[PDB]
Structures are given as structure tokens and as C-alpha cells.
Amino acid sequence: SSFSQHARTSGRVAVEEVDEEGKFVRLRNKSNEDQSMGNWQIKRQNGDDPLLTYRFPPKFTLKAGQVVTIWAAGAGATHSPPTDLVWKAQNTWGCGNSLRTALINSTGEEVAMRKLVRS
DNA sequence: GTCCCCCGCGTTTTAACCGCCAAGGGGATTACTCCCTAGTCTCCAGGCACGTGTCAGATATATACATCCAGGCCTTGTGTCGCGAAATTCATA
């Protein structure tokens, strides 16, 4: 796939899938309990590109075993909570050989991260 | 990676203990008595040895009841394409 994926998780939510073209960001709650992700921050790093910061609404909770996918403006997807959300303020999550998607909670702590590395 | 929670250290508490006091409870000892049972015999019947009958579970089968599985059925997201609504560009009165 030419993009190595590094998965690390210390909480309940893991970064399930990252789009190489930056169309969407997919996270998974692999525990057996619902995770409240109110005002959690998603920071996307594309190599040396400036950070794109996405902020969730003040009250948001992902049910256990459910999938929420954050789509970009250029993707053309339709938001449908609690499973589908679209970030119209950003045309695309970006591209590059070093794509890093870090999930930041409301306390500014990194609990999940997945990095796409291409030789 | 997360986090929290003993660890080490400094400050307050406070009783551990060595010492001194006394009582006395009873443990140990001794003299006294008393009686319980091993020992002896006598006698006898109760549990072992043996044998035998016969049914509880081994053996076997057939059956009603709990489980995996899917097909049918209803509600919902997809696709479509002719035409309204907007602009456009120019012929011409």
C-alpha cells in the first residue's frame, strides 16, 4: 500500500481508517462502552503542511462499536450524526507521504494516533 | 501511554517500657481416703462363611423438547429523466 500505518491506543477510541487523499477521517470505539468525545480535537498533520484543527460540538458521544467518519468539503458526503459528519470548513484533509491523524480530547491530551508513512 | 499512589521525609502524638510500689490466685505439694477396673472365671449368642435368590442399573432402543438456521416480509436509500427557471445572444422595428 506504500503507506505504513502505526496504531497506538491508551483509551477506548482507536483511529480505524485514514484516507490517503484526505477525503475522510475514520475512528473506531473498540471498547464495550460508549465514549463521550464532547469538544475533542482532531489535529491533522500532512508532513510539513500547517496543522488543520477540527473541533467537535460541545456535547458529542460515540456509542460503543459504532463508526463516525469525518468527511471533508471536497468529498461531497452528507452529515448524519452520530455516524456521519462533514467538515465543510476544510476542502480536504490534505495529502503527503507523512500523514498523521491525532485524536485530542477536551483536556488537550493525545489518546489515539495513526500515522501514514510513505517511503 | 495513563495515572495514581505508595515512598521518603519532616512534624505532632503519644504511649512503651523500666522502674517502682501490693494483692492475691492458684499451682504445686502432701496427707488423707475411696473406688474402678483389670483380672479371674463362667456362660452364651452374634457376627462371620457360606450359599443362594433376584432386581438396579448396565444395555439398549424410541421419543418428545431446546437450538441453528434461513426464507419471507416490510420500510427505506438510489436512480432516473422530462421539464420549470435562469441566463444568454442576437435578429430586428
Closest by alpha carbon to A18, among A39, A44, A38? A44
Which residues are paired to A38 by β-bridges? none
Helix/strand/coil (H, E, C) string of A24-60? Answer: EEEEEECCCCCEECCCCEEEEEECCCCCEEEECCCCC
User: How many Å separate Cα A33 from the centre of its chain?
Assistant: 19
Closest by alpha carbon to A38, among A104, A102, A85, A112? A104
Peptide bond into A82 cis (omega under 30): yes
Strand B bases, protein C-beta under 7 A? 1-3
Residue A5 (CA) to nucleotide B44 (C1'), in angstroms, measures 100
Q: Are strands A13-18 and A84-87 parallel, antiparallel or unpaired?
A: unpaired
Query: Contacts of strand B, CB cut-off 7 Å?
Result: A 8, 10-11, 109-111
Which residues are paired to A97 by β-bridges? none
Helix (H, G, I), strand (E, B) or coil at A111: strand
Helix (H, G, I), strand (E, B) or coil at A4: strand
Method: cryo-EM
Residue A78 (CA) to nucleotide B54 (C1'), in angstroms, measures 86
Confirm if A8 and A106 have CB atoms less than 8 A apart.
no
Instruction: Write phi, then psi, for A80 (nearest 5 degrees).
Output: -155, 90
Confirm if A67 and A28 have CB atoms less than 8 A apart.
yes
Residue A108 (CA) to nucleotide B11 (C1'), in angstroms, measures 39
